[PDB]
UniProtKB/Swiss-Prot annotation, chain A:
One of its GO terms (cellular component) is cytosolic small ribosomal subunit. Signal peptide: none annotated. SUPFAM superfamilies: Ribosomal protein S8 (SSF56047). The keyword Lipid metabolism does not apply. The lineage of its organism: Bacteria, Pseudomonadati, Pseudomonadota, Gammaproteobacteria, Enterobacterales. This is Small ribosomal subunit protein uS8. GO terms for biological process: cytoplasmic translation; regulation of mRNA stability; regulation of translation; ribosomal small subunit assembly. It holds the Pfam family Ribosomal_S8. One of the primary rRNA binding proteins, it binds directly to 16S rRNA central domain where it helps coordinate assembly of the platform of the 30S subunit. InterPro entries: Ribosomal_uS8, Ribosomal_uS8_CS, Ribosomal_uS8_sf. HAMAP family: Ribosomal_uS8_B (MF_01302_B). One of its GO terms (molecular function) is rRNA binding. Part of the 30S ribosomal subunit. Contacts proteins S5 and S12.
UniProtKB/Swiss-Prot annotation, chain B:
Belongs to the universal ribosomal protein uS15 family. One of the primary rRNA binding proteins, it binds directly to 16S rRNA where it helps nucleate assembly of the platform of the 30S subunit by binding and bridging several RNA helices of the 16S rRNA. Binds to its own mRNA, stabilizing it 5-UTR and preventing its translation. In the E.coli 70S ribosome it has been modeled to contact the 23S rRNA of the 50S subunit forming part of bridge B4. In the two 3.5 A resolved ribosome structures there are minor differences between side-chain conformations. This is Small ribosomal subunit protein uS15. Induction: Part of the metY operon that extends to pnp, also has its own promoter. Keywords: Ribonucleoprotein, Ribosomal protein, RNA-binding, rRNA-binding, Translation regulation. GO terms for molecular function: rRNA binding; small ribosomal subunit rRNA binding; structural constituent of ribosome. GO terms for biological process: cytoplasmic translation; regulation of translation; ribosomal small subunit assembly; translation. PROSITE patterns: RIBOSOMAL_S15. The keyword Ribosomal protein applies. InterPro entries: Ribosomal_uS15 (IPR000589), Ribosomal_uS15_bac-type (IPR005290), uS15_NS1_RNA-bd_sf (IPR009068). SMART domains: Ribosomal_S15 (SM01387).
From Swiss-Prot, chain D:
Keywords: Acetylation, Ribonucleoprotein, Ribosomal protein, RNA-binding, rRNA-binding. GO terms for biological process: cytoplasmic translation; translation. This is Small ribosomal subunit protein bS18. Part of the 30S ribosomal subunit. Forms a tight heterodimer with protein bS6. The chain holds residues 20 to 74 of 75 of the full protein.
Swiss-Prot record, chain E:
GO terms for cellular component: cytoplasm; cytosol; cytosolic small ribosomal subunit. GO terms for biological process: cytoplasmic translation. 5 different forms of the protein, varying only in the number of C-terminal glutamate residues, were isolated. The sequence shown is form bS6-6, which is the longest. The first two Glu are encoded by the rpsF gene, the other Glu are added post-translationally by the RimK enzyme. One of its GO terms (molecular function) is small ribosomal subunit rRNA binding. The gene is rpsF. The keyword Acetylation applies. It comes from the Bacteria. Part of the 30S ribosomal subunit. Interacts weakly with uL2 in one of the 3.5 A resolved structures. This is Small ribosomal subunit protein bS6. Keywords: Acetylation, Ribonucleoprotein, Ribosomal protein, RNA-binding, rRNA-binding. Belongs to the bacterial ribosomal protein bS6 family. The modification N6-acetyllysine is found at K93. It comes from Escherichia coli (strain K12). Binds together with bS18 to 16S ribosomal RNA.
Length: 129, 88, 51, 55, 100
RNA sequence: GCUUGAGUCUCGUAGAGGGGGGUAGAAUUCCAGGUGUAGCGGUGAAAUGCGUAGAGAUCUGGAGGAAUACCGGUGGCGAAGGCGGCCCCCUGGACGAAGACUGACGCUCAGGUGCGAAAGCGUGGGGAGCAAACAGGAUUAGAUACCCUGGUAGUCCACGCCGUAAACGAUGUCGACUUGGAGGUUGUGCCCUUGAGGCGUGGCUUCCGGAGCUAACGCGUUAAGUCGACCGCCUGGGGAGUA
């Protein structure tokens, strides 16, 4: 039933945001981390944090610009029921360029801006603008 | 619903030490034991349709747990059903 | 139900009857059985008696 | 409440008629109003309390 | 081994048999190594309503710990026996003493 | 391999949860009798009906079946159906408090299987009250009705059928996330127990209400909000859930 963690991230964010909430936690995983990275690196959140050894624990700091939140929309795109894989020439570009799409390639979890540069493709995890 | 006395005795009989309560092999035997008991309950009555739901449940469980063990250690499995006496 | 009411007073003084029987359980049982509709009937004795 | 043999404590939870008294009158808690009934019923069956002012 | 409250009411005329009965039911229960935590020969008490015609009747409270088996035969002998006009074996939840 | 998902173990708690056996009081009808005497009953008004073989009314003693007043409650329990006197026996689930075991053993589920109100069917039984059918009396233009006097199946038990209901929250199951307020219910930790309590921390529930959602009504931490997994189903009305 907890069969898609990444959606739970995308949503713990989405919600916590719409609830003008500063913090947010969840059980972690290499895959969660690699994404939190891109979210920080590309600057949709302040910074993350994983506190624990036995039962690791992602922690994310939400950014807020003006009154609004920085993440205007965080949406799953691949998923257990139906998985997605675009090549390189067919990778998606969110909001015409603004905002971005997380994508896991054989050379790690990057953005579409990235993968395009890397010259390769992968599984488009989610969209974020 | 199956005396502490008896319930304990089986944990004692199927797992490592007592305390090894949740060992696969042990649950299966703990269920088995209740199921077989229950037969006499439903012998009389038979109309006790509600209680019956719990018993079927009992079996759905064991069945599931028994399949898991098989996938793990088919040795611990074979030993087990001989020992309890089921599958025919 | 019962009133001793000893010496001085010819006034009935049985207001106790408006404390249980009479149109109490007696208007109740008088007629249409009911059966599950009282459920609905009493679901207004509370949809009201909330305020 | 605690017991049906307590026809003493019990007798102030019924009307002259013998009918159990609603909880909305007695201010009694919930859990206990049941204990109370179930012990008035016991009292009644053991001819320890009338069902009825008819006796 | 389960406890029970247990109380029966013997017909007045047959009052004189109440002793022999208690004596008996006890030897019966203790017989199967069961304790006898309370006993109270309330004697002739007056009734709330008349029952079987006749008012007043000989009561006997009596808490016990004994197997769900002697409890059985008790409940029936209370039927077999016309002198007892009521009985009622009850709850349990550990022994009791004194009350009343 | 891991321990948090899921299981197992200890102790308890609440409960119209289920199956079986006993048993209680009140009422109705009936049988027998005491007293009593010309009406009772029923309606909107009436009549059919009942009563001088003594009715109704009152008292007493019985017989029998059916349901369990008060408690009783936006109370509780169960997967749904649905489950209310009391007691014992047998039994299912739920919950909570400690820690201890198992180590992903899970979620969902076409097909399949089981369950499944009332009516209805088969066999024996049982039959007080109620009551399709039917009969009589009224109303009415008519009255195959609604009202009245009767009353059979049925309603009750056993066993076996049927498998349907506006079987509804008209809202599939599971999981995660998201401001509040006032209750009801039921566990459990702590506090001069010094209050009939004081602050916590679970499960369940009722009423309001915020974002959000909605065609709107409305829903709103028990979502109709934000998300995922799986299943069922919809594709204009009629025809037809018919051939
Ligand atoms: Mg994974
Ligand atoms: Mg009678
Ligand atoms: Mg009579
Ligand atoms: Mg239980
Ligand atoms: Mg069936
Ligand atoms: Mg039927
Ligand atoms: Mg029949
Ligand atoms: Mg009629
Ligand atoms: Mg249908
Ligand atoms: Mg409904
Ligand atoms: Mg609230
Ligand atoms: Mg609302
Ligand atoms: Mg939803
Ligand atoms: Mg058809």
């Amino acid at each position: 039933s907890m069969q898609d963690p990444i959606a739970d991230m995308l949503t713990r964010i989405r919600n916590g945001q719409a609830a003008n909430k500063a913090a947010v936690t969840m059980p972690s995983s290499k895959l969660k981390v690699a994404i939190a990275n891109v979210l920080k690196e590309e600057g949709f959140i302040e910074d993350f944090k994983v506190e624990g050894d036995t039962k690791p624990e992602l922690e994310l700091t939400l950014k807020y610009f003006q009154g609004k939140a920085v993440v205007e929309s965080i949406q799953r795109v691949s998923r257990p029921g139906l998985r997605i894989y675009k090549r390189k020439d067919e990778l998606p570009k969110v909001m015409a360029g603004l905002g971005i799409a997380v994508v896991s390639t054989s050379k790690g979890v990057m953005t579409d801006r990235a993968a395009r540069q890397a010259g390769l493709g992968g599984e488009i995890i989610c969209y974020v603008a | 619903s199956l005396s502490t006395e008896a319930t304990a005795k089986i944990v004692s009989e199927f797992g490592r030490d007592a305390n090894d309560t949740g060992s696969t092999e042990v649950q299966v035997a703990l269920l088995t034991a209740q199921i077989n008991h229950l037969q006499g309950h439903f012998a009389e009555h038979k109309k006790d349709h509600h209680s019956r739901r719990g018993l079927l449940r009992m079996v759905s469980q064991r069945r599931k747990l028994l399949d898991y063990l098989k996938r793990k250690d088919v040795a611990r499995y074979t030993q087990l059903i001989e020992r309890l006496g089921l599958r025919r | 139900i019962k009133v001793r009411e000893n010496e001085p007073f010819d006034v009935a003084l049985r207001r106790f009857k408006r404390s249980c029987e009479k149109a109490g359980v007696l208007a109740e049982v008088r007629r249409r059985e009911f059966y599950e509709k009282p459920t609905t009937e009493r679901k207004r004795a509370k949809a009201s008696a909330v305020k | 409440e605690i017991d049906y043999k307590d026809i003493a404590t019990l007798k102030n939870y019924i009307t002259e008629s013998g009918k159990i008294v609603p909880s909305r009158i007695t201010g009694t808690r919930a859990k206990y109003q049941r204990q109370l009934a179930r012990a008035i019923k016991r009292a009644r069956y053991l001819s320890l309390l009338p069902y009825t002012d008819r006796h | 081994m389960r406890h029970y409250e247990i109380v029966f009411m013997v017909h007045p005329d047959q009052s004189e048999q109440v002793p022999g009965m208690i004596e008996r039911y006890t030897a019966a229960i203790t017989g199967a190594e069961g304790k006898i935590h309370r006993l109270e020969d309330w004697g002739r008490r007056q009734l709330a309503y008349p029952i079987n015609k006749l008012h007043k009747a000989h009561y006997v409270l009596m808490n016990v710990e004994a197997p769900q088996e002697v409890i059985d035969e008790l409940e029936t002998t209370f039927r077999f026996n016309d002198a007892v006009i009521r009985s009622m074996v009850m709850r349990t939840k550990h022994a009791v003493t004194e009350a009343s």
